[PDB]
Amino acid sequence: EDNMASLPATHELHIFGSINGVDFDMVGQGTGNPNDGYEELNLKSTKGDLQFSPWILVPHIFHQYLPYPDGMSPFQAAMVDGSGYQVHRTMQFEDGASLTVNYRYTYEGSHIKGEAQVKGTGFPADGPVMTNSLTAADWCRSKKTYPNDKTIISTFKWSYTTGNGKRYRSTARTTYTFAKPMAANYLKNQPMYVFRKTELKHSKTELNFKEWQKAFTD
């Protein structure tokens, strides 16, 4: 079933699920540069106007594009050798909302197909998500640790800026589960930090996303 692949050059995403019990579904194509972490993605809704801020899909909308300082990231390594990994992210927001995302990928040569299943609940109807008041997301530093040879934990504090210049805050915990053990040399450099920035242009039915990533032993 699983075959060896290459460093990624192109990708696609099917992201779907529900926010406050209302279904959404988006599909589209992207590209990126595995030598510096950069990604671009276009998504189009297949179920009409999004009923919530498209910014809530950031950061969730491909660490296979992330290099490490002295070679491939474990995420990259697992694509190239084909064995891969699965991802579970939980995010809790300061107003009590929460969001889970589960990812599965398949690989063919330099192309990734991603499936991201989202469940968000508890967003207040007058909050910044359900009122489309999010305008931006801050630079964010993630901390990556390895509790065993098949697991990476990524944690980060997350913030959006609203239309009023307020901060909407959350924390995230992401668990990466590798099919096969990671190389021992990864375990010897803990933690790894990754600094990322995101950009989003959107309508109610389409978005264009960009991400920059840089890992540091620091």
Binding residues for Cl ion (CB under 5 A): 154, 174
Question: In this structure, are residues 107 and 115 in contact, taking their beta carbons and an 8 Å threshold?
Answer: no
Phi, psi (deg, nearest 5) at residue 80:
-65, -45
Taking the complex as a whole, how short is the minimal distance between the CB of residue 88 and Cl ion, in angstroms? Answer: 10
Distance (Å, whole) CA 117 – CA 25: 9
Nearest residue (CB) to Cl ion, 105 versus 162: 105
Taking the complex as a whole, how short is the minimal distance between the CB of residue 3 and Cl ion, in angstroms? Answer: 26
Nearest residue (CB) to Cl ion, 170 versus 174: 174
**Greatest extent of the chain over all pairs of C-alpha atoms, in Å:** 50
Nearest residue (CB) to Cl ion, 174 versus 198: 174
Taking the complex as a whole, how short is the minimal distance between the CB of residue 75 and Cl ion, in angstroms? Answer: 10
Taking the complex as a whole, how short is the minimal distance between the CB of residue 158 and Cl ion, in angstroms? Answer: 10
Nearest residue (CB) to Cl ion, 51 versus 169: 169
Question: In this structure, are residues 120 and 102 in contact, taking their beta carbons and an 8 Å threshold?
Answer: no
Cross-strand pairs, 17: 24, 118
Burial (CB count within 10 angstroms: exposed 0-12, middle 13-18, buried 19+), residue 185? exposed
Taking the complex as a whole, how short is the minimal distance between the CB of residue 203 and Cl ion, in angstroms? Answer: 27
The distance of Cα 148 from the centroid of its chain, to the nearest Å, equals 22
Nearest residue (CB) to Cl ion, 73 versus 162: 73
